[PDB]
Amino acid sequence: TKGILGKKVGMTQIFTESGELIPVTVVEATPNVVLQVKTVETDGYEAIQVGYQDKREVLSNKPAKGHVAKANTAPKRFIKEFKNVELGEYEVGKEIKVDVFQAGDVVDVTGTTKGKGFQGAIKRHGQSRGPMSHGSRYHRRPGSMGPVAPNRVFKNKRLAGRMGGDRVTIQNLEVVKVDVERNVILIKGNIPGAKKSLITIKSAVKA
Amino acid sequence: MKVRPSVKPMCEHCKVIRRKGRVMVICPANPKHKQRQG
Amino acid sequence: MIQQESRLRVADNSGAREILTIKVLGGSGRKTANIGDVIVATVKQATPGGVVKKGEVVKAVIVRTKSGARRADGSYIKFDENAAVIIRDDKSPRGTRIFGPVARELRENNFMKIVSLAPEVL
Amino acid sequence: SRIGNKVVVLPAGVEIKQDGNNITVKGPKGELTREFSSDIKMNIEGNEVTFIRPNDSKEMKTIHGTTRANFNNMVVGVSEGFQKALELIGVGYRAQVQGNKLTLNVGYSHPVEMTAPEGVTFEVPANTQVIVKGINKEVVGELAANIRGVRPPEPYKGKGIRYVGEFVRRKEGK
RNA sequence: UAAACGCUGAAAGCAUCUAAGUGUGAAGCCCACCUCAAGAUGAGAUUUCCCAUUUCUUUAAGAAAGUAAGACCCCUGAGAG
RNA sequence: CACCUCGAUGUCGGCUCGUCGCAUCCUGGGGCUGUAGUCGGUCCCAAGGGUUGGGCUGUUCGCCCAUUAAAGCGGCACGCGAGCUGGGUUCAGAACGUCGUGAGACAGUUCGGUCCCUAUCCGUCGCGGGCGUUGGAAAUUUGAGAGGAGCUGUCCUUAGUA
RNA sequence: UAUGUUAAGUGGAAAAGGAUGUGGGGUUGCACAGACAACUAGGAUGUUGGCUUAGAAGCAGCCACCAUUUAAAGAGUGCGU
Ligand SMILES: [K+]
Ligand SMILES: [K+]
Ligand SMILES: [K+]
Ligand SMILES: [Mg+2]
Ligand SMILES: [Mg+2]
Ligand SMILES: [Mg+2]
Ligand SMILES: [Mg+2]
Ligand SMILES: [Mg+2]
Ligand SMILES: [Mg+2]
Ligand SMILES: [Mg+2]
Ligand SMILES: [Mg+2]
Ligand SMILES: [Mg+2]
Ligand SMILES: [Mg+2]
Ligand SMILES: [Mg+2]
Ligand SMILES: [Mg+2]
Ligand SMILES: [Zn+2]
Numbered sequence: 001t002k003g004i005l006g007k008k009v010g011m012t013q014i015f016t017e018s019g020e021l022i023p024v025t026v027v028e029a030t031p032n033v034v035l036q037v038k039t040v041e042t043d044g045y046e047a048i049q050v051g052y053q054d055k056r057e058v059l060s061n062k063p064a065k066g067h068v069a070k071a072n073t074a075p076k077r078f079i080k081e082f083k084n085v086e087l088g089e090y091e092v093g094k095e096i097k098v099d100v101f102q103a104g105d106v107v108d109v110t111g112t113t114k115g116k117g118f119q120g121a122i123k124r125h126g127q128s129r130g131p132m133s134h135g136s137r138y139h140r141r142p143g144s145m146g147p148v149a150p151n152r153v154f155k156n157k158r159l160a161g162r163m164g165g166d167r168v169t170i171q172n173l174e175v176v177k178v179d180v181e182r183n184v185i186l187i188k189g190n191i192p193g194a195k196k197s198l199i200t201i202k203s204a205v206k207a
Numbered sequence: 208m209k210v211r212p213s214v215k216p217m218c219e220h221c222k223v224i225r226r227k228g229r230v231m232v233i234c235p236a237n238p239k240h241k242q243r244q245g
Numbered sequence: 246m247i248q249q250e251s252r253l254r255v256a257d258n259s260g261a262r263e264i265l266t267i268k269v270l271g272g273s274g275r276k277t278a279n280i281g282d283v284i285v286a287t288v289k290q291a292t293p294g295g296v297v298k299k300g301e302v303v304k305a306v307i308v309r310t311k312s313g314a315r316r317a318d319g320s321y322i323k324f325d326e327n328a329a330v331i332i333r334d335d336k337s338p339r340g341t342r343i344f345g346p347v348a349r350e351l352r353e354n355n356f357m358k359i360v361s362l363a364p365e366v367l
Numbered sequence: 368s369r370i371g372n373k374v375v376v377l378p379a380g381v382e383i384k385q386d387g388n389n390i391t392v393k394g395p396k397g398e399l400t401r402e403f404s405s406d407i408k409m410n411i412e413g414n415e416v417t418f419i420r421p422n423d424s425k426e427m428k429t430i431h432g433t434t435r436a437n438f439n440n441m442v443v444g445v446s447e448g449f450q451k452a453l454e455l456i457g458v459g460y461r462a463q464v465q466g467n468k469l470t471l472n473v474g475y476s477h478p479v480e481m482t483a484p485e486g487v488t489f490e491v492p493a494n495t496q497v498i499v500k501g502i503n504k505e506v507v508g509e510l511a512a513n514i515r516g517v518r519p520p521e522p523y524k525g526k527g528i529r530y531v532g533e534f535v536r537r538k539e540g541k
Numbered sequence: 542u543a544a545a546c547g548c549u550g551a552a553a554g555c556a557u558c559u560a561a562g563u564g565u566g567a568a569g570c571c572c573a574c575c576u577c578a579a580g581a582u583g584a585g586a587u588u589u590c591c592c593a594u595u596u597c598u599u600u601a602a603g604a605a606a607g608u609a610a611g612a613c614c615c616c617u618g619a620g621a622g
Numbered sequence: 623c624a625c626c627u628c629g630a631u632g633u634c635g636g637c638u639c640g641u642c643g644c645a646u647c648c649u650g651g652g653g654c655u656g657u658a659g660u661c662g663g664u665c666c667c668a669a670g671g672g673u674u675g676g677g678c679u680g681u682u683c684g685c686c687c688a689u690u691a692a693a694g695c696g697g698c699a700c701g702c703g704a705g706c707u708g709g710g711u712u713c714a715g716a717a718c719g720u721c722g723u724g725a726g727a728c729a730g731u732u733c734g735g736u737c738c739c740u741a742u743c744c745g746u747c748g749c750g751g752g753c754g755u756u757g758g759a760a761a762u763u764u765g766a767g768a769g770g771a772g773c774u775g776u777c778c779u780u781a782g783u784a
Numbered sequence: 785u786a787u788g789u790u791a792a793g794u795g796g797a798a799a800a801g802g803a804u805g806u807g808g809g810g811u812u813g814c815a816c817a818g819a820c821a822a823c824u825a826g827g828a829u830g831u832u833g834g835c836u837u838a839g840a841a842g843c844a845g846c847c848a849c850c851a852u853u854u855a856a857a858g859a860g861u862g863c864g865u
Contacts, residue, residue, distance in 0.1 A: 008620095019318040036588060036762080043587050044764050062610065063590035063760045070588090080761060115621050118748080121639090130638055130706065138706035143639035145746070147701045153746040154641070161748035165621085169575060170702075194620040205574070208653045210666060213802055214568085218826075223803065224557060228792090230803050233557080239654065245666075249675065272673055272775070273690050283687060302688080368554045368821070404561080425552065425806085427776085429560060437562085441547075458784075476583040476780045508548040509564060516546075516565080523658055540658040 001084045003202030004032050004096055005052050006185070008111070008193045014176060014186065024176055027185045027199055030054075032096040033073050037087055047083045051076025052198070069072050078198045098185055103177050109170045110200040111193035116163035125128040125158040168192040171206060210245040217242075247314040247327060254291065254328040256308050256347075259340030260295025261288045262331045264329055266304060279308055280314045281354040286292060297331060297339060305329045306336075306356060308343070308363075314350045322348055322367055329357055338362070371431030375416040381446055383416070385409060392438075394445035396502050397486070401441065403434045409530055421428070444502040450490075451511040452531035453497040455518070460526075461494040473518040473528065481514055496531075 006029035014024045018044070029052075036049035053076060060075030068075055071093040101107075121127045121142035130138035142160070145153045162181040185201065194200060214230050216223060217240040221232050232238035246254070253264040267285040269278040278284060284305040291298045308330050313323035324346075331339040334357050347363035360366055377383075387406040390409075392399045403409075407430060408419040416438065420431040421532035443449075455462060459471050469489045471479040483499075484488060487510060497514070501507040511530070520527035523540040 013319075021317065021319040038763085047763085049588085049762065061590080061760060063588090066589040067761075068589090081762065117622060122746090124747095128638065135707055136637085138638065141638075141705065143637090144702040144705060146640070147698045149698055149701080150745090152744080153780095155746070157639080157746055159747040162622090167576065171574080193599070196620055208666065211802085212800095215802060222557070223791065224559095225803075226558070228805095230805095241654075243666085268675070268688050270689070273692080275689095276675080317645090370551075370554055373554080396617095401562085426560080429550095429552045432554090433549095433561070436550055474784065503549090505549045505563065510548090512546085512548060515563070538655095538657085 001082075001203045001205075002100055003082050003085075003200060004098070004100065005078065005080055005198060005200040006030070006032075006048060007053065008191070008197045008199055009184075010195055010196050012186070017174065022176055022188050023190070024186045024188060025191050027187060027191075027201065029183050029185055029201075031098075031183060032091055033071055033076065034090055034094045034096070035068060035071050035073075035076070035079065037090065037092060038081070039087070043044050043060070045083070046085075046087055047081045048087065049079065049081050050087060050096070051079045053077040073121045080142060080200060082202070095149070097180055098178050098183055099180050101175050101178055101185060101201070103175050105175050106204045107173050107175055107187065108202045108204050108206075109173055109187065109191045111170075111191055112197060113164050113166050113168050113192045114194050115165050118161065119163035120160045121158055124160065124163045127158070172204060209239070209242040212244055214242045214244050216240070230231060247282075247284070247307055247310060248276060251327070253284075253286070253307070254326055255331065256328040256344050257330050257338055257340035258342045259331045259338065259342075260297035261291050261303075261331055263288075263290035264331075265289050267302070278307055278313065279310055280348045280350045281356075282307055283332075286329070289304075303331050303339070304333070305331050306351075306359070308347050308351065308359065309345065314348050369432075371418050371420065371428070371435045373434065374434065375442065376412050377416075377442065378446070379414065379481045381442055383411075390438075392441040392445055393448070394442075396445045397450050399441045399445060399502065401437060403437070404430060406430060407434050440504050444504060448500065448502055449504050449507050450498050450500040451507055453499070453511060453514060453528055455495050455497065455528040457526045460518075462491055462497055464489045464491040464496065469514070471514075471517060474526070475518070479517050481510070481517075483510060497528075 006027040009026035009028050012024045012026060014022050016022050032050050032052050034048055035051050036109055038045060038047040038049065040046060051073075055075040055077045057065070057075055064075055073093070116123070120140055122129055122140055127142055130136055132139055142158065145157060170189070170191055172186045173191070176188050178185055187201075191199060214223075214232055216232055216234075218234060218237065220236045221240050223235045224231050224233060225243045232240060232242035247266060247269070249266055249268060253266065255264055261346045264284075264286045266277045266278075267287060269275045270283045270285065273279075280305045284307060286303060287306050288297055288299055288303065291301075297303065306329060307327070309324040309326070309328050311324055311327055313321060315321050328345065330343060333339060337358055341362070343359060343363045345363075346365040346367050347360060349360075349366055351357075352360050381392070383393070384391040388405055389400055389402045406427060408421070410417045410419060418431055418435050418438070420427040441467055442521060450492060455471070455473060457474060459472070460474060462469050467483045467485070467487075467489070469481045469483070469491075471481070473479065483501075484506065486503060487499060487501040487506060492498065499507050499511045499514070501510075515528045515530070518527050520529055520535045522538040525535065525537065529535060
């Protein structure tokens with residue numbers, strides 16, 4: 001497998017070797033850097049730790065500089081691990097350019113969703129509003145909590161709370177174009193996240 | 208298969224066998240004589 | 246976005262003048278239709294000396310809609326009225342001459358006779 | 368009557384190797400091994416072998432007969448082998464062998480591929496006459512049954528794969 | 542694995558899917574897909590950083606009293622609320 | 623039967639939310655057929671998911687229309703009124719028929735008619751503080767274990783072949 | 785401790801009924817001039833007994849059931865024509 005991680009920019013609207021539009025999301029992938037390589041004999045599993053976005057040193061800290069110093073790079077902001085990849089191909093200090101991907105390949109995209117805040121059950125779970133006339137006093141509410149006999153409410157009864165902030169994949173997307181000069185990927189379709197938010201791109205698990 | 212607690216043979220060619228702890232009747236000639244308990 | 250109890254004009258000479266959607270076909274809980282989607286309907290207003298007459302239950306095809314259609318290239322068609330064409334079990338029409346324009350989306354759904362009989366196909 | 372006390376002829380060229388368990392058999396066709404239990408007594412002569420049970424219980428009579436039968440199977444397979452002859456019949460049915468990989472045309476939209484292990488052969492003397500051939504009676508029967516289960520017989524017209532020589536009843540469908 | 546299909550096979554010289562042995566076999570079960578998850582008090586693992594000071598009491602896993610790494614207060618704010 | 627409830631017991635139906643069982647409506651597997659093929663009938667396994675919208679009636683049911691792959695049966699105080707409605711329930715008014723000598727009543731019907739509560743505890747959904755994890759801290763993580771999702775039609779081809 | 789039984793978690797839920805489950809006891813039949821089960825050879829004739837029916841001619845409906853070599857064959861067990 002493979003992958004990178006990058007920053008969401010925004011949406012566009014693109015023509016692909018024909019007049020057929022493709023809506024597109026822009027991911028800026030300033031070249032990721034390997035920092036650590038984990039193996040079974042020391043760490044329990046094969047994996048590779050990666051950093052994306054350079055901090056200022058005043059924002060970083062000593063024990064992070066010490067972790068970056070092996071690869072001989074600058075303090076990174078977002079740090080993540082990639083699993084189920086070849087370790088003989090990758091080394092500490094290696095820079096992962098966007099050239100790794102080929103326009104057209106199928107891809108999976110993780111991101112943290114836009115915070116919607118403390119929301120009701122209707123918006124949070126698609127529940128239906130009660131009637132708004134005919135004497136109804138039941139408009140935006142989640143309904144009964146359950147039967148009588150348990151004398152208790154069953155779990156996963158869906159209610160109001162924080163909507164958003166969750167980690168979400170989108171599978172079976174497609175890479176539309178690459179710009180290594182600009183370090184940009186164009187991905188067919190919407191993806192989870194606010195702008196200036198982290199995204200992880202990976203080769204598809206299903207494909 | 209004829210699943211019935213009153214398993215008992217229907218012709219002379221029926222054999223009775225306890226198979227996986229269940230009683231069964233097996234006739235090669237007539238498979239309608241095939242029976243089981245349940 | 247054509248629903249049950251939604252009224253439609255008629256775009257052929259079959260005999261009908263106004264139509265009311267009984268149900269949409271396709272699936273179990275389809276609550277909506279657009280161009281290329283077949284309809285089951287009544288006839289609320291018919292031409293007087295018409296074959297198709299008041300009260301008859303009949304199938305139909307949506308040919309143009311305000312909530313219109315979309316193309317791969319972002320080109321979208323829309324209309325100022327919701328109209329339909331009455332058909333038989335086969336995709337062929339009851340009448341003989343379609344009025345007004347028609348969307349291109351029907352050629353994929355194999356209403357080719359209606360596409361031909363229509364004067365303008367957008 | 369009894370089976371297990373019946374002696375077991377080699378007859379010659381066949382050889383064996385006792386052990387605490389996992390008895391081995393050898394000869395012209397090849398090798399075989401199997402783990403008979405340590406409850407049976409294995410008496411041996413130069414040409415003849417016998418099994419003796421410790422007592423006259425249900426379980427030991429059973430094991431006695433079963434071990435004699437399996438040992439006889441191993442010997443007979445190493446000497447003469449085994450073969451199951453199949454006969455596939457139909458309008459447009461045929462078969463062909465490519466090494467250890469049998470191909471079957473039996474009416475399904477796609478041709479079907481079966482494959483044997485090293486200890487089993489597919490012969491195909493004719494397009495409709497398959498033969499499995501081998502040395503382990505279990506594996507031979509298993510493969511022949513798996514093959515027969517691709518398109519088994521039918522009563523109305525007979526279309527399907529068979530064992531050569533079996534009986535396949537037929538109904539007078541309208 | 543279910544039901545079903547068995548292969549070999551004996552009790553019961555045959556027969557038999559089973560008793561031992563062995564195998565096909567379902568939208569179902571455990572995985573595989575996604576998410577939460579070390580408060581998993583059974584509290585895990587790896588990398589990196591700070592270092593082993595002062596006094597008093599004591600052989601005390603002692604007490605306070607300034608600090609390193611670091612964090613917080615406070616302030617400007619939203620991609621958050 | 624009258625054991626609990628008359629110093630409260632709220633009565634049907636619908637709505638919102640669902641959850642469970644399997645005696646399985648569909649999908650999935652298989653045997654038998656009086657199964658030629660398509661359709662099927664029946665039985666065994668299977669509860670993973672799904673199991674429609676309207677007219678009439680207060681209605682459950684039921685009939686009808688039109689679809690559906692299918693339009694399951696039941697339980698959870700005939701689930702759920704400190705979550706909603708209050709159409710139906712003879713509260714008080716009035717009237718028809720009928721009964722009564724009558725005041726009034728229904729062996730029937732009809733029009734109209736106040737649904738109170740700031741959530742303490744558990745429970746549920748979410749968010750924190752404290753402490754702990756045996757020196758203090760910054761990050762990344764395995765993953766026990768839990769949950770979620772689990773559906774399905776139509777067309778084409780194989781082939782107008784078997 | 786001693787002897788046995790059970791193989792279902794019976795024990796630790798429930799019937800009519802069904803079953804080469806298993807242990808005990810008894811009765812009875814056949815059996816080393818060879819039991820039972822299997823394998824081999826035969827399994828027929830005057831005769832395709834007749835009636836029957838277009839056709840039953842061993843086995844649709846209908847009577848009898850002699851004879852043969854015998855080492856044994858029913859004037860025919862079913863399928864099926
Ligand atoms: K309780
Ligand atoms: K009461
Ligand atoms: K309640
Ligand atoms: Mg209001
Ligand atoms: Mg398997
Ligand atoms: Mg009280
Ligand atoms: Mg069931
Ligand atoms: Mg309604
Ligand atoms: Mg109306
Ligand atoms: Mg209730
Ligand atoms: Mg009322
Ligand atoms: Mg009154
Ligand atoms: Mg009077
Ligand atoms: Mg009023
Ligand atoms: Mg409240
Ligand atoms: Zn039988």
